[PDB]
Amino acid sequence: ELGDSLEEFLAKATTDKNLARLLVCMGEALRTIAFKVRTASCGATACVNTFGDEQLAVDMLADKLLFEALRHSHVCKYACSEEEPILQDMEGEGFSVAFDPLDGSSIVDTNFTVGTIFGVWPGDKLTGITGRDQAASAMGIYGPRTTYVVAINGFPGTHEFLLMDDGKWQHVKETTEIKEGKLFSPGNLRATFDNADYEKLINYYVSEKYTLRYTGGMVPDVNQIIVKERGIFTNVTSPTTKAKLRLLFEVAPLGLLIENAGGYSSDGKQSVLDKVVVNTDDRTQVAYGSRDEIIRFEETLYGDSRLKAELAAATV
Amino acid sequence: ELGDSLEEFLAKATTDKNLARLLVCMGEALRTIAFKVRTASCGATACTNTFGDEQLAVDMLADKLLFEALRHSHVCKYACSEEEPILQDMEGEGFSVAFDPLDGSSIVDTNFTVGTIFGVWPGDKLTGITGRDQAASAMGIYGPRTTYVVAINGFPGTHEFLLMDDGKWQHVKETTEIKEGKLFSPGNLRATFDNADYEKLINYYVSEKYTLRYTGGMVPDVNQIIVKERGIFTNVTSPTTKAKLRLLFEVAPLGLLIENAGGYSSDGKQSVLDKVVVNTDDRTQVAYGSRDEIIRFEETLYGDSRLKAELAATV
Numbered sequence: 001e002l003g004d005s006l007e008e009f010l011a012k013a014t015t016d017k018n019l020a021r022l023l024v025c026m027g028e029a030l031r032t033i034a035f036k037v038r039t040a041s042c043g044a045t046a047c048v049n050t051f052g053d054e055q056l057a058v059d060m061l062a063d064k065l066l067f068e069a070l071r072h073s074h075v076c077k078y079a080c081s082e083e084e085p086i087l088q089d090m091e092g093e094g095f096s097v098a099f100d101p102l103d104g105s106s107i108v109d110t111n112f113t114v115g116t117i118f119g120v121w122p123g124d125k126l127t128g129i130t131g132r133d134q135a136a137s138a139m140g141i142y143g144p145r146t147t148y149v150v151a152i153n154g155f156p157g158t159h160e161f162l163l164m165d166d167g168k169w170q171h172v173k174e175t176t177e178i179k180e181g182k183l184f185s186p187g188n189l190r191a192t193f194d195n196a197d198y199e200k201l202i203n204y205y206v207s208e209k210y211t212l213r214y215t216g217g218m219v220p221d222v223n224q225i226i227v228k229e230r231g232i233f234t235n236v237t238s239p240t241t242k243a244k245l246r247l248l249f250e251v252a253p254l255g256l257l258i259e260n261a262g263g264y265s266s267d268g269k270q271s272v273l274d275k276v277v278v279n280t281d282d283r284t285q286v287a288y289g290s291r292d293e294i295i296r297f298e299e300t301l302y303g304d305s306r307l308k309a310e311l312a313a314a315t316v
Numbered sequence: 317e318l319g320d321s322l323e324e325f326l327a328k329a330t331t332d333k334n335l336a337r338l339l340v341c342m343g344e345a346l347r348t349i350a351f352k353v354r355t356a357s358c359g360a361t362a363c364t365n366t367f368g369d370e371q372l373a374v375d376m377l378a379d380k381l382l383f384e385a386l387r388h389s390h391v392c393k394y395a396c397s398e399e400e401p402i403l404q405d406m407e408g409e410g411f412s413v414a415f416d417p418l419d420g421s422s423i424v425d426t427n428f429t430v431g432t433i434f435g436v437w438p439g440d441k442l443t444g445i446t447g448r449d450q451a452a453s454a455m456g457i458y459g460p461r462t463t464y465v466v467a468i469n470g471f472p473g474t475h476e477f478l479l480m481d482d483g484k485w486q487h488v489k490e491t492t493e494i495k496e497g498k499l500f501s502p503g504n505l506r507a508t509f510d511n512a513d514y515e516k517l518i519n520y521y522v523s524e525k526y527t528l529r530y531t532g533g534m535v536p537d538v539n540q541i542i543v544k545e546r547g548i549f550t551n552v553t554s555p556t557t558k559a560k561l562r563l564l565f566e567v568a569p570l571g572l573l574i575e576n577a578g579g580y581s582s583d584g585k586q587s588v589l590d591k592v593v594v595n596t597d598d599r600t601q602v603a604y605g606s607r608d609e610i611i612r613f614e615e616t617l618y619g620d621s622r623l624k625a626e627l628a629a630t631v
Contacts, residue, residue, distance in 0.1 A: 037460045039481055042488065110540040111459030112429050112529070143427035144353045144458035165355060172358065190525040209506040209557075213428070213531045224426040241525075 006148065006161050006169035013155045018075045018094045019135050022120065027148055027161075027169050029069035030116060030140035033062045033102070034163065037142045042109040059083065059105035062116060066099050077124045082249040085280040087126060095135065096126050098280070100249040104217035113143035115219025119253035127280060131252030131273035139219050139257065147172075149223060151260035158226055158261040173227070178263035178290045181230025182210040185221045187245075189214075191238040198236045201300045205232075218245070222254050222288055226261050232289030234297060243283035247275060251286050264294040268302050322464070322477055322485040329471040334391045334410045335451050338436060343464050343477070343485055345385035346432060346456035349378045349418070350479065353458050358425040375399065375421035378432060382415055393440045398565040401596040403442060411451065412442050414596070416565040420533035429459035431535025435569035442596060447568030447589035455535050455573065463488075465539060467576035474542055474577040489543070494579035494606045497546025501530040501537045504551050504560070511554035517616045521548075534561065538570050538604055542577045548605030550613060559599035563591055567602050580610040584617040 001012075006027055010020035037058055040047040046057040051064050063081050067088065070076040075094035078087040082100040097120050104114030120136040121129055134153050141147040146163035157176045161169035184205040192199040205212075215221055225231040237243050245251050255265040255272040265272040266287045275284065287297045291307075298305035320328075322343055326336040352365040353374055362373040367380050379399050383406070386392040391410040394403040398416040413436050420430035435453045437445055447453075450469050457463040462479035473492045477485040500521040508515040529547075530537055541547040553559045561567050571581040571588040581588040582603045591600065603613040607627070614621035 034460070038462075039478065040461070042461075107529075107540075108460065110529075110536070110543045111457045111461050111463055112531070112536055112540070113427055114460055141427045142460040144350065144424070144430060144460075145356070145427050146354075147427055162358075186528070189528045190522055193522050193525070206506055207509050209509075211532065212502070212505050213423075213426075214528055215428075215531060216527065216529055220426070220428055224423075224428070227426045 002171050002174070004171045006171070009159065009171050013152045016135070019120065019152070022070070022073045022075045022095055022097075023136060023138065023150060025069040025073040026066070026118065026138065029065040030148055031146070031163060031167065032065050033116065033140060034142050034146040036061055037108060037114065040108060047105070047108040057105070058108055059102040062101035066101055066116070066118070070097055078126060080126050080248070080280055082246060095120050095122055096124055097121070098126050098248045098253070100246070103219050103250070104215070107215075107217070112215050112217065113141060113220040114217055115142060115223070116140040117219060117250055117253050119248070119256065126248060127277050130276050131255045132271075134252065134256050137253035137256040139223065139253070141219055141223055143220070149226065149257060151257045153256060153260070156260075158257050160227070175226050175229055175261040177229060178225060178258070178261055179230050180290045180292050181228065182208060183224070183228060183231035184210045184212060185214045185224070185231065185233040186212070187214065187216070187221070187233065187235030188237070188241055191236050191241050193238070194240055195236060195238040197301045198238070201234070201297065204296070204300070218250055218254065222258065225263060225289055226257065230290055232287060232293035232297070234287045236285050236301065243285055245283060245286060247272070247282045247284050248277045248280050251284055252277070254288065258288045263289055264291055264307060266294050266298055266307065268298060269306055318487050318490070320487045322487070325475060325487050329468045332451070335436065335468075338386075338389045338391050338411055338413070339452060339454065339466065341385045341389040342382070342434065342454065345381045346464055347462070347479060347483060348381050349432060349456060350458050350462040352377055353424060353430065356424060363421075363424040373421070374424055375418040378417035378421075382417055382432070382434070386413055394442060396442050396564065396596050398562055401565075403596075410438070412437050412440055414442050414564045414569075416562070419535045419566070420531070423532065428531050428533065429457060429536040430533055431458055431539075432456040433535060433566050433569050435564070435572070442564060443593050446592055447571045448587070450568065450572050453569035453572040455539065455570070457535055457539055459536065465542065465573060467572045469572060469576070472576070474573050476543070491542050491545060491577040493545060494541060494574070494577055495546050496606050496608050497544070498524060498526045499540070499544065499547035500526045500528060501540070501547065501549040502528070503530065503532075503537070503549065504553065504557055507552050507554035507557045509554070510556055511552055513616050514550075514552040514554070517550070517613065520612070534566055534570060538574065541579060541605060542573065546606060548603060548609035548613070550603045552601050552617075559601055561599060561602060563588070563598045563600045564593045564596050567600050568593070570604065574604045579605055580607055580623060582610050582614055582623065584614060585622055
């Protein structure tokens with residue numbers, strides 16, 4: 001079924017009413033964020049709007065709104081934001097949540113799509129956990145449309161909801177397979193200058209006349225894969241460059257969205273969903289995309305693909 | 317001064333009340349297009365919404381809104397859309413307008429920023445003209461914010477208007493300088509496979525650790541230069557790749573926006589504003605950006621930069 005509301009969908013997708021309540025609460029925060037971004041005041045140094053009687057940069061505004069939603073749910077024990085990665089007690093029980101409140105906040109003024117990412121874990125820990133342990137993950141996407149993209153672990157597909165004029169979130173798409181195509185989204189392209197293996201990968205994409213779409217914002221750049229049902233996103237390090245992407249706040253949540261969509265993730269060797277978060281600031285390189293492009297990523301950077309070898313053993 | 321309405325700005329920017337009427341009418345089309353995109357139904361094959369009694373894909377919907385706005389203005393003789401590049405008589409007098417109704421329409425479903433581009437020429441022709449002859453040019457930008465970016469030829473600056481919640485356009489930025497920075501937006505990157513000059517140019521940017529920002533969509537990709545006051549957009553052809561960008565509907569309009577903002581444009585040899593549109597669907601390579609980036613682009617393609625010589629001949 002499509003065309004159902006987020007509440008109706010969640011009743012079908014999970015027996016866990018507390019997880020559904022948390023995802024509805026977070027949808028209200030996303031709706032409010034989208035409106036605060038839509039008529040923010042953008043200046044030399046920041047884009048701002050108000051939270052109550054105060055004026056706040058939109059990323060901080062988003063952070064407040066998300067903590068407030070988690071507290072209102074009553075089903076959150078700890079929340080952690082990528083802004084201030086200390087664990088905050090949200091005075092509830094059931095789940096702990098890590099979020100990146102506004103990926104792309106620095107380029108709101110340019111009017112490119114920006115977004116929110118969050119992962120939901122059962123229990124009271126946001127370290128010593130893996131992405132595979134998430135109950136759900138989701139993104140809010142603030143573009144010419146406002147969408148809310150959700151994966152419930154253990155229930156098929158990644159599901160897109162459109163914000164309607166009357167405030168409701170309507171189920172508009174389900175993705176269950178990522179196919180092979182000719183789209184690439186190359187993060188940290190500068191690394192090709194001194195990582196010859198990344199350069200070789202990029203050169204392959206260019207030689208095969210792939211389409212380039214990359215904004216530097218993880219939300220849109222990975223959402224496009226889910227929507228188009230094809231593509232490859234990469235973000236690779238070099239000796240001289242370092243890893244910007246956080247496992248807990250960004251990479252694990254997105255990994256669930258991609259893998260629930262029938263895509264694959266990699267850090268070079270393994271699914272990003274099998275990496276333990278040791279510390280909340282832990283960084284990683286990553287790729288997301290179709291099967292063959294992930295094998296290519298792994299073979300080109302590290303010679304051998306574990307994904308390929310994994311597949312060759314479910315075959316035999 | 318900022319905070320003024322579109323109408324207040326236009327009364328300061330030009331004495332031409334007919335040009336102002338046209339630009340206000342177009343702003344209302346842009347406001348409507350933004351809504352149609354925001355609420356479109358994106359299905360298996362298209363993103364669709366309503367126009368009167370019809371459901372239409374959003375690019376075609378935008379096309380109809382823009383022709384309707386031009387007819388309603390009473391001040392447009394001919395209009396030409398990139399979707400069907402023939403002249404259409406809008407039953408008015410004063411200006412002829414060329415437009416690209418929805419740049420990026422095929423990626424609406426991805427929720428990436430998309431936009432409208434148009435140029436406004438006095439009189440009755442849209443061929444045998446140059447970009448420099450425009451009265452004005454503008455883009456509508458459909459992102460998480462809805463903006464209308466306007467240049468009035470002969471009046472300083474490029475001017476950004478934000479759509480407020482009350483449905484009105486408010487002046488929020490004037491750009492008059494484009495500085496040097498480390499941002500590139502490389503269109504047609506596939507051409508580096510078999511255009512060694514473009515390959516070298518991209519090497520340069522990568523060697524200097526530039527930030528990449530490109531979504532296929534001329535509008536956001538060029539708008540970011542105006543907003544950040546830095547950067548370089550390029551689109552260069554190779555023997556195995558066509559030139560996709562149209563001079564009339566896209567490149568000349570955006571040239572006026574960039575040059576009014578204190579940047580520069582180039583086809584490799586000259587401002588895009590000096591190229592004659594011979595046929596409505598004529599194509600061109602292009603770059604837009606800061607002074608030094610445009611000099612580099614020209615030297616990369618030809619060894620010498622006509623821009624560099626021009627700037628010297630004045631200094």
